[PDB]
């Protein structure tokens, strides 16, 4: 109906006006007085050399020592990052895998991809082998991200426009989130696991409520698909990485963009995004085979992490902030300290 | 300078790498094909000749083939088409009898043009199957080809129309030097449809081997 369209456009205008009114001073002009961090140099401490194809995802354990990586050769590998040992190697039923996760307690891992199914594996069994514990079906598109809430809950985002919160004990969708108009490509859990954000292919991001399920606020400003998202350690901000060669910082309380991280010599899209322990540096992986470290408060390139011969697809930072691991479309992972 | 447990862990790790190497060597000896179509082209009968992705395995002349059918993935093609960069060849199915209406031939042409000229599929050759040819002869006998192709000047004979369709499909590739297109008339015939695939894949493998040498 025309009345619905008029009401929607009026509400959009009012939201834009309120957002403009709530802005009083840019973050950069406030911050400029602080001391810059200067050059940041990181050396490849370790190189993990097991896979045989492109690496699409990785995750860190909560003990900052064990990590899991997934590649398109149909293998899940758990590494001891201190000594580069292979603790486990899990063969997948389907070789087209685009996501990976590690349980907070260390008992389980998760997987998923083009087969529209999330698989849960039991690492600590009395039989001495790793076996699949539950297969969660019900998505009508490929799986793009998954994150554990605890040993019995998990939240997944798919390319079928929707997100869902599962229940591994029974395998049923407890809640479903439906407000996007394109594929959902990324996910990020809040520190207290009460909210989470999603980055979709309609160049927008939304903030959900896990307990009951509904979109609280939506944040716009990008120009193309959002490929990565991550929460600020404070839990009151997040950063997105899209395909127009830019990264942005949004704040929940103000409900407004804060800063933009772009440069003229970069024209390729961003594949992954993560912060540092104090929230001062913002790391981002690019398609030009480099990872760029950004002064998150001044949008200045502090450093560059150039050691990969192909596109960097995954990127994570340990829980104690002591190391950062990158994977790329060659079969190697690297640890930078 | 390692304790007993550390030495045992290193031994277990090394066994893991040995198994991974064996699995990779086994997997490298296989032919991976990607099957594409316009939904009603006849990929089903092609599969008969030999919820997400669908896989099909078959063997011909001591060679192992793997065919991946992406037909139920109704999402953005740009977001997962780079997974298949590296397949040996792409099998494209188009029905010669699907020029009636509901346009369908033009949709097939658009899909072929988009897939053929892609960043990832710059070197992967294409095997084209123009199936349902008896229906095509029946349709030609009654209706002329000018409905789908208004700018056509030739006799209403099966051979001429089939050659015109093949040429109009084959002239859609811009990189006429890095890529090759093999065309076949399926008709739901006997097996040549696997012999033709075997020949095309052998040519692709010979060219890849010559590239690996350095002469190309």
């Amino acid at each position, epitope marked *: 109906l025309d009345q619905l369209r008029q009401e929607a456009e009026q509400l959009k205008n009012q939201i834009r006006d309120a957002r403009k009114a709530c802005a009083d001073a840019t973050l950069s002009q406030i911050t400029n007085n602080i001391d810059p961090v200067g050059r940041i140099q990181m050396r490849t401490r370790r190189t993990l050399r097991g896979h045989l194809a492109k690496i699409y995802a990785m995750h860190w354990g909560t003990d900052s020592r064990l990590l899991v990586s997934a590649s398109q050769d149909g293998k899940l590998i758990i590494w001891d990052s201190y000594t580069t040992n292979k*603790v486990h190697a899990i063969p997948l039923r389907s070789s087209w895998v685009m996501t990976c996760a590690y349980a907070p307690s260390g008992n389980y891992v998760a997987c998923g991809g083009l087969d529209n199914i999330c698989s849960i594996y039991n690492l600590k069994t*009395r039989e001495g082998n790793v076996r699949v514990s539950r297969e969660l079906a019900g998505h009508t598109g490929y799986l793009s991200c998954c994150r554990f809430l605890d040993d019995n809950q998990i939240v997944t985002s798919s390319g079928d426009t929707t997100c869902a919160l599962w229940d591994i004990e029974t395998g049923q969708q407890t809640t479903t989130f439906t407000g996007h108009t394109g594929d959902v490509m990324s996910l990020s859990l809040a520190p207290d696991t009460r909210l989470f954000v999603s980055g979709a292919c309609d160049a927008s991001a939304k903030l959900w409520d896990v307990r009951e399920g509904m979109c609280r606020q939506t944040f716009t400003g990008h120009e193309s698909d959002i490929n990565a998202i991550c929460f600020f350690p404070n839990g009151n901000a997040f950063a997105t990485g899209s395909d127009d060669a830019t990264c942005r910082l949004f704040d929940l309380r103000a409900d407004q963009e804060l800063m933009t991280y772009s440069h003229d010599n970069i024209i390729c899209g961003i594949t992954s995004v993560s912060f540092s322990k104090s929230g001062r540096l913002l790391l981002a992986g690019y398609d030009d085979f480099n990872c760029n470290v950004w002064d998150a408060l001044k949008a200045d390139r502090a450093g560059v992490l150039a050691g990969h011969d192909n596109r960097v697809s995954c990127l994570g930072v340990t829980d104690d902030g002591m190391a950062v691991a990158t994977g790329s479309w060659d079969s190697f992972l690297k640890i930078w300290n | 300078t390692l*304790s*007993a*447990e550390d030495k*045992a862990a290193v*031994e*277990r790790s090394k066994m893991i790498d040995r198994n991974l190497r064996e699995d990779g060597e086994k997997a490298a000896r296989e032919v991976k094909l990607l099957l594409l179509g316009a939904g009603e082209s006849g990929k089903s009968t092609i599969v008969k000749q030999m919820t997400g992705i669908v896989e099909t395995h078959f063997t011909f002349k001591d060679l192992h083939f793997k065919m991946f059918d992406v037909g139920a993935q109704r999402s953005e093609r740009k977001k997962w088409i780079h997974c298949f960069e590296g397949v040996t060849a792409i099998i494209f199915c188009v029905a010669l009898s699907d020029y009636d209406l509901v346009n369908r031939m033009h949709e097939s042409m658009k899909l072929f043009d988009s897939i053929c000229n892609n960043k990832w599929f710059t070197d992967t050759s294409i095997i084209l199957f123009l199936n349902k040819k008896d229906l095509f002869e029946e349709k030609i006998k009654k209706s002329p080809l000018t409905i789908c192709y208004p700018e056509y000047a030739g006799s209403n004979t099966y051979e001429e129309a089939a050659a015109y369709i093949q040429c109009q499909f084959e002239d859609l590739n811009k990189r006429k030097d890095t890529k090759e297109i093999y065309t076949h008339f399926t008709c739901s015939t006997d097996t040549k449809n696997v012999q033709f695939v075997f020949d095309a894949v052998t040519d692709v493998i010979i060219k890849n081997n010559l590239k690996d040498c350095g002469l190309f």
Partner: single-chain antibody
Amino acid sequence: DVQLVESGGGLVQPGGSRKLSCSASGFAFSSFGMHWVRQAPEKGLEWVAYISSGSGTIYYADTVKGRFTISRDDPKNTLFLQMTSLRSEDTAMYYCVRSIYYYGSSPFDFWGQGTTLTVSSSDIVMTQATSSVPVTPGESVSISCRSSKSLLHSNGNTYLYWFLQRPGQSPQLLIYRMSNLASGVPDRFSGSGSGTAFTLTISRLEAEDVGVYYCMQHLEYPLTFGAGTKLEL
């Protein structure tokens, strides 16, 4: 069911050539390193031989080196100990312990049933001091075990293990690496201590906790066992 069944032991003449078979059913036998542990009647445990996963590493005890031979058959899920030229010092009950080694694993968790055999008539030293102490239900007691060399390693691990043997049964793991509780063990057990001075406490003791308590070392082969403190009353 992770049971292990051992058979082939019995009365032997001196200089015999008896061999024992250990059959496994209920776990991935190919990925577990298997030990052989004996026990003289009026004595304590004593490690004998070890064979790794993939059969790439084999270690023996000085007492039986050159006289006992160990082997495994992965497809048949059997563990062999072929021994030749027996003597009167080998009369003991033999166990078939299993162990898997990766980062965070718990070796020496499941112990076999024991097959008795009777024969016709730079090593770390662990001292357990006390050999008997009476206890009462509802009380808390502590057991001490001392090592000749510092078990603490340069990577921070203190390789010390605790075992409990109920009367007429097989020992079961309690603590591994001096602090970690074994799976299924009640929480009333706790372990602590530093290099060359270790202490296991049992707070709020109750029944089914009596028996003999041992300590072991996994820093370097040959592995050694303590004398054992018997808990009664």
